[PDB]
Design a protein around this ligand. Structure first.
Ligand SMILES: [Zn+2]
Ligand SMILES: [Zn+2]
Lengths: 134, 4, 134, 4
């Protein structure tokens, strides 16, 4: 299925044109180990996203440890507390992780919608503030 | 690294 | 997915018009526990099949213990050696069981093809035996 | 019980 993102090897494969290779701390192996997928755009060519909590990080430096960055920016991500390898998870555990991923993807869309609305509400509020002046 |  | 047959509750649901109910040893719960699905036909209305090794059994008696029958008729079925509940299986274990099920379904089709061919070969051999007499 |  597309439970593929739970597989580290699938995650590593996303970093086809990730620029940070051998010599660096945030190599594709390390990024994939930490739960990241490479999601490059034009404004952000090193954009990476956790497959599980959906936190999006960019502006990577060579010395960045992906695990430490993931912890700093998204300290509650359940993926960070998975100590077993994928194949060692029980089905019950896997299913619970997959439910938690879905809850995470609702906190993410909700969050993006809130942000977008507030951008608009500020502009609107500003305009009406001017009218209320008389 | 830093947030979008 | 149709990994549904690994779920006991799905298996129990197949026995909609299974005739052996409370009071009997081979009740739907017990049959489903042992790995059976109800596959009724006209010539065999109590036909039941193991979802995992695909052994097909009919002519059930009230006192039949489904586990014991499964062991007697298909002693090498790996499902019989699963001691954990489904949710307690690891993914690696589940995947290995699913590969073994697929190997079982190839031993079954192969077996049915052999049987069919031999039915024909007997008839043919009989005919040619008569011609060879002179 | 018995085989098909
Ligand atoms: Zn995360
Ligand atoms: Zn079996």
């Amino acid at each position: 299925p597309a439970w593929q993102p739970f597989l580290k090897d699938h995650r590593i494969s996303t970093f086809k044109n990730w620029p940070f290779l051998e010599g660096c701390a945030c190599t594709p192996e390390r990024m994939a180990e930490a739960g990241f997928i490479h999601c490059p755009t034009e404004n952000e060519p090193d954009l990476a996203q956790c497959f599980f909590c959906f936190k999006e990080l960019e502006g990577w430096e060579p010395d960045d440890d992906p695990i430490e960055e993931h912890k700093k920016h998204s300290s509650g991500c359940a993926f960070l507390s998975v100590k077993k390898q994928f194949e060692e998870l029980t089905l019950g555990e896997f299913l619970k992780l997959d439910r938690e991923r879905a809850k995470n993807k609702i906190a993410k869309e909700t969050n993006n919608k809130k942000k977008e609305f507030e951008e608009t509400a500020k502009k609107v509020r500003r305009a009406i503030e001017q009218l209320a002046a008389m | 690294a830093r947030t979008k």
